[model samples]
Target chain A: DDIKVAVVGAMSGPIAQWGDMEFNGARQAIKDINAKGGIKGDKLVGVEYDDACDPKQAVAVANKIVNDGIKYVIGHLCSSSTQPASDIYEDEGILMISPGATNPELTQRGYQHIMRTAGLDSSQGPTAAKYILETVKPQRIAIIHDKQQYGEGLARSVQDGLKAANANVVFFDGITAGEKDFSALIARLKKENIDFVYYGGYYPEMGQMLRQARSVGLKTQFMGPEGVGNASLSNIAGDAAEGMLVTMPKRYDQDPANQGIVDALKADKKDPSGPYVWITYAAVQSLATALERTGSDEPLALVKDLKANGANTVIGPLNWDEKGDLKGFDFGVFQWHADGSSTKA
Target chain B: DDIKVAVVGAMSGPIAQWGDMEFNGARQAIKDINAKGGIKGDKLVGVEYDDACDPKQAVAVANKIVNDGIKYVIGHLCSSSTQPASDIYEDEGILMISPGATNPELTQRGYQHIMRTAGLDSSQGPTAAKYILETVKPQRIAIIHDKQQYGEGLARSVQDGLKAANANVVFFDGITAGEKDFSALIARLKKENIDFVYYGGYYPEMGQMLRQARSVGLKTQFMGPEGVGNASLSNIAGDAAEGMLVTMPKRYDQDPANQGIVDALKADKKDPSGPYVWITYAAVQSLATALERTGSDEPLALVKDLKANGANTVIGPLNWDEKGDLKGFDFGVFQWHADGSSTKA
Candidate 1:
């Protein structure tokens, strides 16, 4: 009996650490499963690659996955990469699942060939919106966007939900992305007398904006998408980053629900505090469950069984729509401290 | 050391549970500190109030802190609450440090009396933008706003910064905040022919947007302000949230760095895995540092010491600006999975 699983992600970017760690975990997990009479006693062979968090590279890697004739794949710390490569997996009829990449549309496109081990942005955006209304009760709110598929769409979703809660939105606008600066825009926030702001973008701009805003004497409360809040931002924007709000989801490996797995990771000299291990482990678990349920290692048979029995197979208890979209997900509210780390908001 | 501290937050809103949790931590911290020589060997008495995440209530709480003879006050989560309250805290000579608030404005007002342990939206906005530009490499992008102060302002900053990078935003618009539904907006996104979206709002409306977006076959990747990516969002949006992307401060409670603190929480039968506990713990630590450095047991002294020293403690060895903002706060990218948890981005 033979089953081969391939893992792909950015193994060499600033966030490349995430991919490497995940791949190692997947390797260990596959070894463990094999030692324990893996997936109906079939040994699992795990392979890996670094997509470098690039979409085109992800597609190139997708070609690699197909060429290698792997039955299952676990990949990505980048949505830009995973979102597109999923189509490649679907066309090749391979069961492709990602432990990262939550762009909300990865599975929403009804791609019959893909599934994510991650939650969608929709779930996160609205929960935070409602919470803000109940707690902050701002008289006038402003929403901004970064103008990418990810930013504007997610911002619109949150704005709509917040309005339903009866919170008034003051100003909404679109912004250019990756400018390394933001003083001019921050000035506008003051001009509009914004009570609160919700920005849908990333951290480089956020840091520059905060620094410039502080320099210009605009003290407005701000919040952003998860991508905007990161440890790296600490180095990019010193002190100016204080008091920013963001959202997060409970990490599975860190959750109380998976203590057993937690203990196992510790024993392996590997940490299981972030969702990385859980996502990787869950990916393997999903791949195995699909194989076991189908009672065949053949990729096609595994696909059929997975589609039919898209129920709790680890990796967020896999529940796939007819189109292979995920049906499970979650989000959490958190605050960024002086350090880059976040706390529940 | 006859000192008094007050806690403020949204104690009775939808996420009131969070306020309660933070308060519980704050209370316990005070008790623990008091037991451990209590800031120069004197007991610390504490009182708490509900800002309800409202600026008005935040102002009211500031009054109460000043009136009750509380030298130091912690709290009022949501940036809106903390932003307004900062002005009052400075005026009233009450030393204020928020445990969970993360709006840059709180610290940017040049208020020597105000201190925040959280990062700013500017820190987050840029993180998401740079990551997308470098990794996602979306040639043509679009920006949208939720019309909430947080959404609009943050998104605008991202857009401006991205502009310098030569990544232009194609579309800009505003949608109402907190709408219970999002079909119409979803249609608009499709019509815009946008590839990515950034939202500057919370999670409730995001959930509806994703659900409706999926129903209408409007498929696009989404990202949002941190408010949009909370654990609660998954419960609201379900699988529709999969593939969504978010940026947040790196959550180290999951990192190997905070092992002792994480264990400390578990010892109390509290989940260290929860971001709230670490956040509250960090809040207490920052306050304690301020008290110890000042050693005056007075609000004025605490603020002076905090502003002057930029205390270094846990949570990545904290440091803040003259305005009481952290010198270097960071954010991270996170993805949601179908299993109700998130992956570190």
Candidate 2:
């Protein structure tokens, strides 16, 4: 018998940092498992496919993965791609375990074989709201989103949390993606004397907005969902990004249990702490453990075992709820550094 | 132990059809082999990476594959990507078997470890020139290239063959890749009374050129090298693509020897005769056979065996010359139909 799995993500385009991290984490897991002589007398092998974060391409890659006889997959990174590709995977009976796609509909839609290792934006948004309302205590708040599924969903959820606490939200708006100039948005922030901006968007537009806002002498501290926690943000926004408060998933690599794997990643000239790396490793760890316990790579069998058990991985134990999402997760505030590093706040 | 190989290409962008075919062909080969028991005592596993036909991304992916502990790669469909990636694979001492990268310099630089299943443009260019001069002789000829590595190189080589045959070439020039309005170029062809136009660019631009030329009342026949053989060519050019002659590598699927594999591909819901499919299957065939013959997946040992004894594949025996290129290849002419199919002309 042979064991085959696929790792799909946007490995070459704008959000490739996430894809590369996912790939690297899985690669390290495969090597470790193979060195240990594999599970059930068969070696674990991973096949990579690129979706480039395009939903149309993700659907095509999903079909190709199913055609390859891969019963399991580790990704379709962005929520936009994941939402569409999940339908194809569900139809094909392919079990997918995403590393970092946080859109709630993935599991909320009742996919029997789909699970997520990372926390959902539903949890992240509220956590960011709590941190903003209780800790920063800004006088005026401005909320903006790029109108994407993940961005808009998270931004609205954060607004819900803010309203629950009766925090002052002075402004709200949506911006189209790929719009280079955010001068109008910045002018509004400046005019409103907004002390804080909560944007639910990916790093590209967020970075540019931060730079343009700073260029025009606006000092409103910016924060966003986990999507905006990329290191390249500083590179794009320059010093404007330093000290920027952001909500990010807990850094699992800092935990002692993952030290060896983290060092292994470093030795390979790869960043173990890159976005989504820990969760990707955890997804593979979960799959490998389930395969070992069940002694099969069959999708249904793996799914049953994954549901019934918990996997102790570098990211800690993963216990799935009925919806196939992690039972527990924590979103924390981080301070962005000029070198693109972050520390828990 | 499991043997891992990577397939890198533009799996999700404009040229994704080519990348998808290479991946589909490789996966089919893996399934067929594993169902019958894999090479030696190990299962064959295939991984895919997307360069999106971008050279910088191609280099990044080459490094990632190596970091994944893969010793073999069957990939990089485009010549522009293959050129730089081949350099990285050579420096890192990894073996690469390309399914479709026809630029002559791939093997000309004396990389001891790299080989190609597809024939070089050096041969394909001369072959196109010979066919045009002998079979479809015209009063005047015009050659246009996109000024990129693959196009300009192939166009120049074809120009050499035309000059060698002492044929009249009316005009030769380069056009920008994304140029949509080819009215000026069409006017030149019309003014020259060109009966044949040889273009050495990809199908996207070629399709536009064909449609634009037809719209401008230019009735000249069109011809191009293997780069123009994609099915999307007809989809874009519409009826204007009918009767267009294209020089492509020999279709192994047309041979009765490959009928079973073709059916196997169709059974998996994949295209049986997609562009570069046979050659990609042949690449895996070569890799699997080498690993079995040597009883090892060691890169150095496999490379030694690949050079000394050669590999047996679906396309026929893969005997490499001293320069690590196919000793001989056959390029044939085909006519494009409006339904996006091609047959021997």
Against the true structure, whose DockQ is highest?
2
* Residue pairs of candidate 2 with colliding backbone atoms: A48-B48
Candidate 1 chain B lDDT trough over 10 residues, lowest sum: B10-19
Cα-based lDDT for every prediction: 0.67, 0.78
Give the lDDT of residue A217 in candidate 2: 87
Q: How would you encode candidate 2's per-residue C-alpha lDDT over B1-345 as one tens digit per residue?
A: 777889877543334556767877898889888887888557888876767565556888898887888899998876657878889898888989888743455777888778888765446677788889889998899999998555777799888889888898888999998788888999888888999988987676889999999898788999987667655567678888898888765678787988988887765546677647888888888888888888875666776787788887777777778677876455778998876688897
Ten-residue region with minimum lDDT total, candidate 2 chain B? B10-19
How would the docking of model 2 be graded? incorrect
Work out the TM-score per prediction.
0.39, 0.39
Candidate 1 scores an iRMS of 17.8
Q: Candidate 2 chain A — worst ten consecutive residues by lDDT sum?
A: A10-19
Q: Compose the digit string of candidate 1's lDDT tens values, residues B1-345.
A: 466678777443323445655765676667677777887886777676766554555777777677777777777665556766777777877777776643334455567777777665456677778777877776556666676445677688678768878885777777776577666667777787767777765566677777777776656777775666655466667787887877766776777866765665555444455445556656776778877776566676776666567655445667767766665565777887644477876
- Model 1 chain A TM-score equals 0.62
Candidate 1 Cα outliers beyond 4 Å, as residue runs: A1-19, A28-70, A75-93, A100-111, A118-127, A130-140, A146-150, A164-167, A174-195, A202-221, A230-242, A248-252, A271-276, A289-328, B1-345
- Per-residue alpha-carbon lDDT of candidate 1 for residues A81-181, written as tens digits (9 for 90 to 100): 77678878888888777877334446667666576665554455676686678766777788888775446766887798888877788878887776766
Overlapping backbone residue pairs in candidate 1 total 161
